[PDB]
Write a protein that binds this DNA or RNA. Sequence first.
DNA 1: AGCCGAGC
DNA 2: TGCAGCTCGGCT
DNA 3: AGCCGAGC
DNA 4: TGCAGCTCGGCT
Lengths: 668, 655
Amino acid sequence: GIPKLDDANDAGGKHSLECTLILTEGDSAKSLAVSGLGVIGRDRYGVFPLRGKILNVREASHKQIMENAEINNIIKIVGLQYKKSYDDAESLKTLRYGKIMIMTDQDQDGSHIKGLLINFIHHNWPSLLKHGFLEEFITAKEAKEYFADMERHRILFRYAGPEDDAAITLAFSKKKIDDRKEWLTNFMEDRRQRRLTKHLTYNDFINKELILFSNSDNERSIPSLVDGFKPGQRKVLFTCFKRNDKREVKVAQLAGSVAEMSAYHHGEQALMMTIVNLAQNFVGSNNINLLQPIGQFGTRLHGGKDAASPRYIFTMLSTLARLLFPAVDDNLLKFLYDDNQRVEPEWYIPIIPMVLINGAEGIGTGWACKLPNYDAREIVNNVRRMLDGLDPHPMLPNYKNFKGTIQELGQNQYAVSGEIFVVDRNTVEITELPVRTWTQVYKEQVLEPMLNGTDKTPALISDYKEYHTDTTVKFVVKMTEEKLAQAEAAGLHKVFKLQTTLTCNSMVLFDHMGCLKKYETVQDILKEFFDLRLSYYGLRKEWLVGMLGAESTKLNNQARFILEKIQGKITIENRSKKDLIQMLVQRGYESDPVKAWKEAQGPDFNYILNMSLWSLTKEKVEELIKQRDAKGREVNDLKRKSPSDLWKEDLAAFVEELDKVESQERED
Amino acid sequence: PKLDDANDAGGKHSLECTLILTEGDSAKSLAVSGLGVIGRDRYGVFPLRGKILNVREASHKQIMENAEINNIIKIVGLQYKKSYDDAESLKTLRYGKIMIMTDQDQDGSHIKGLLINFIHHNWPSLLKHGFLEEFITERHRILFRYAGPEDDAAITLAFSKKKIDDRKEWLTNFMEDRRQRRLKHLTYNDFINKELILFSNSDNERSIPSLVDGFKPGQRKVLFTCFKRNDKREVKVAQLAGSVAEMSAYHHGEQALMMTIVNLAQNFVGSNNINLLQPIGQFGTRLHGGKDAASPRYIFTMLSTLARLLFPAVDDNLLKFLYDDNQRVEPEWYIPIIPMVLINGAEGIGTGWACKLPNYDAREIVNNVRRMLDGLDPHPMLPNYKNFKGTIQELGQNQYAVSGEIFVVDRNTVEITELPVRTWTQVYKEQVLEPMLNGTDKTPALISDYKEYHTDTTVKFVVKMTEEKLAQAEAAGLHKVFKLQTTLTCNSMVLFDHMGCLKKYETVQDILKEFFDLRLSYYGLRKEWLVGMLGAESTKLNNQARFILEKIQGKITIENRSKKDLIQMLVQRGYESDPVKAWKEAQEGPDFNYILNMSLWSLTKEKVEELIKQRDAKGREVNDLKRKSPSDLWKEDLAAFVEELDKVESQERED
DNA sequence: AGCCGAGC
DNA sequence: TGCAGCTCGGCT
DNA sequence: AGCCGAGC
DNA sequence: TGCAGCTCGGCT
Ligand SMILES: COc1cc(NS(C)(=O)=O)ccc1Nc1c2ccccc2nc2ccccc12
Ligand SMILES: COc1cc(NS(C)(=O)=O)ccc1Nc1c2ccccc2nc2ccccc12
Ligand SMILES: [Mg+2]
Ligand SMILES: [Mg+2]
Ligand SMILES: [Mg+2]
Ligand SMILES: [Mg+2]
Ligand SMILES: [Mg+2]
Ligand SMILES: [Mg+2]
């Protein structure tokens, strides 16, 4: 079921240079293109669908170029020849089509695909672009009307000088990473400032269109310092909070639900894989998985590649999630809008830097991000130290349930070791692989070549048996004692490849202001998170004091009303809204306190009059007095606490449950 | 599909080895996993990704090209025609046993049967040695045992094309024995008659629609979800499928929902006479009979305005909603105001029975329902397809001729302006006009040229011919020559009746009459329910009006009195315990909350006046309703539906 | 020989 | 019920 | 010569 | 982003 060409009738014959090959984004668009052309259109227009991102040929290997489906189909269809230059009219007589018309989604990923296509032709046949060989096109009845007016939707790329060569090269050469950081830096800065046509050159296309994809790539791929999330991830968590599921949801159904509630504009299978990623809890994945892995979500045996299909596995929130992201704090977040639907916030504000717990990592354009896992209790403890004006201890990466060793070689430089021990003089036991070394891989890339030997080396070991579980590693290895002697004389950890380095010189993240920023040490990250989170505890307090104050005023008025009613001092019986409103005002009743507070962020006495008739009864009077006083005491107790104290209460509540859950995990 | 061959497979311990066939990759994954380290020596795992070929009467070419069959043959080293009677013969096999490991559900069992069918047909001897076993979900290993000729009959009964009438009797008996009831080794015979029959039956339940609403359970779940969701904006189909799956506890692949949803939204000539979902996007055309629908991820839908008009919301109160795992789901059926099983032409393929019904005109059905409300006999009906421009005429009992349109323009030219229903434009072009133009290896060219002037929803061919050929064509009969006549035969109108029983209907009038009697009494039930409910509301309002009035005239006080004292006081003064709660109770101390929950606003002048007005309006509302007959209520509905039908259908002709 | 459609 | 290769940067 | 993951 | 072949009964 590979992609299928619908070849123009006149292709490869007398009228080849008059034929256009339409390259579309996916097969639906191919079907619609074909029906919009109709029978008369099929003469000079072919259609072939590209099913996703294609090879960057500029510095790909010869193998990749030879073996690539899309690249090679384009060549056969068009009749291109490597190394041929198309300078003359004469040279063009060997082509089956005279131009390619790119027809992709009018979105950023669409633009990326135009780029890769441009990159392709530019790298191999620049002499073609001089002839103007590339064009773009920017319900089946709607597709027919579009095509009858083809010329009005048809843009022609023009080559206009070396500035085009440089633009294309800037965007796609592996040698141009630093130029792209500069390019995008100028873009990003230029954009925060502003906050305060038949022909299209390649230069303009790169700098006015493709750059939008490049910036979007960064926005979806590089996590926020604040909550450790990428936008898709944040959309999943937002949906899960809103749904509040108390039994397991199938992952595919959760995916679709996230897509609806959060206005997710991409393929739901990306959402699915993301969900699987958030739930994983095997060694080297998440230190705290926010979703529960209910079913086969992958094991350390294959690094999670052995997860079952999203249609057959289930998940729900961890009991730790709302402890980490307290509900009350949602009141302080800037929620985003998409199509005037309210969606996920700009960022959540967790009580500890989640960006460090689960080890953010993404690859963008210009930058990429990698951070290892850090230990949660160790981070809780440093937040506590900072809350008391003490210095934070330095911190080593730490991966939950990892039995091995992480040693600091230098700044952002670590050696990571598994565990091997000598049992007898014929036997070693391997009980830990280094973090991110998966069991099957180690077995086939290390133990097998040791058993069988290679052409380069003779067999070092004699036998090995496996006694693993789903979550632990046990290899028993037999060796002649002469052989054991040598391996032991060399490094055991060395000979058996149980040492890997870990290097973190690209801790790139979006700061709370949404600016892309490079962090030298996790200390910087912790400090920047800390000032912000402390500040937001100030806000939570301001918000609560205001709110609870209004609720107290509200209750004072309500209680006063009831009491005066039963005492005969007011009557409302058979009196006009007009007379009642003014009567309340003159008796000094406050307009709705909670509404007036919410606004500040005629007089309204509905809060009083909407009360039920039960309110006047004996028990309901006593109860309202108790509520009024309770609420008064609530406001005051809270005015006395500091933001630090609030933070500490959260920390204590989180840790308590982290103990239960993790203790539970070690027995389940 | 990847095999994981057993380490000792094909060698000398071949017969000690066991090939585990699974239903799906995740299953093979879990099986390869759970085999442990030592399991790799003696056990192979190979996944089947779904229903396999029924080889018992398949063509030679089918058997020869089938991926699953031939993979299993290679892996086990089976050889056609080779008898495996003795010890010697068994040496060639690379495995000694096949262990079938399917889902523990009906479809699972069906795959088991297809596998049994396959081995039994080609190598019956192999089963006499006990070749096959299963893993139900070491004490999970069940062995299939051949115990005599009654096992050959049981397998043949389930899988032979020659045994449709026997399956009919088979399933009939099962259905009766279950209806009356509603008050380790394993022989093949017992497998077929105790396990496989469960699939056969629920295959019918999911494939053959109900008479009452013309839905199958999957369709019905879609509708249920759509009503609950109540969308005002379009929804992506793929997302709607998942939403349906979740809200109605659907236990199958969501891609099937997606196609079902698409099938319900289609409105091209030949599909639905009234599409209940809207086709927002490319959902298919008459050009390709819908096979040109785009992907479910890129098309959208929402309810048609006619949906709640055909399935009035108030009627939901009379339905029997089912339960799946503590969760309340769709009803056993909806009760529409006209028989939808006839409008949209229900059709489905089961085991033993199938169902085919053609479409009937909606207005003609409304008129017939009107005649019946008057005690007249319904006019006979003919199949009728919205926007079909041809002719459908009776040839006999449940047999019809369906004709397209062709006419001679001049002595060289004919126009074809309509194709028989269900003849798709592209197919007609490739399979008729092209051969007629180019000739074939067999037939000669008939025409000299043709040109197309189709719109998206109509058909227009202009054909050129020499005078000689045209005359010959007229002689033979134009409709016959250009294949513009189809017959339609309807001797398989099988449906589930309102009571759950599978039934054959000889005439559409019988379906109509049955549906009518049922819908009429549900209007009886709707009236009863409305009178009781509006009634209780009126009592409620009276009491509230009475309290508010007594309070205002100081004849009662609640101020500072205890809850015990208040309730007693209300009882003494003859106030009623919650009337609406009492009536909902009778649908199978004193509650006065409906009074004391009223707000203090209730005591103010304008609110006193307003409550008085509402009380009187409710009394009149009860009376206006008691004055209407079940029959009058039905007629109101039909009038409203028809008004909207005209509006909708007129806007389509304009768009 | 293949279409119709709800399942794998 | 499953599966079909790439992009982009850092680093190994 | 390939892994990490959010996209097509 | 797509695509891979079958069951089952009644007809054409
Ligand atoms: C037996 O069923 C299948 C076998 C294979 N194997 S192979 C070697 O041909 O590739 C592959 C797929 C299936 N089953 C299929 C489906 C199963 C579940 C849900 C949808 C399916 N859609 C299919 C579409 C075409 C072909 C097989 C499908
Ligand atoms: C260029 O992208 C694709 C090309 C093909 N063509 S071919 C001849 O190899 O079969 C096929 C698929 C793709 N794109 C893919 C995806 C696109 C969107 C969403 C998920 C995709 N998953 C893929 C998985 C494997 C291979 C290609 C995929
Ligand atoms: Mg797109
Ligand atoms: Mg992770
Ligand atoms: Mg199943
Ligand atoms: Mg239909
Ligand atoms: Mg690379
Ligand atoms: Mg058949």
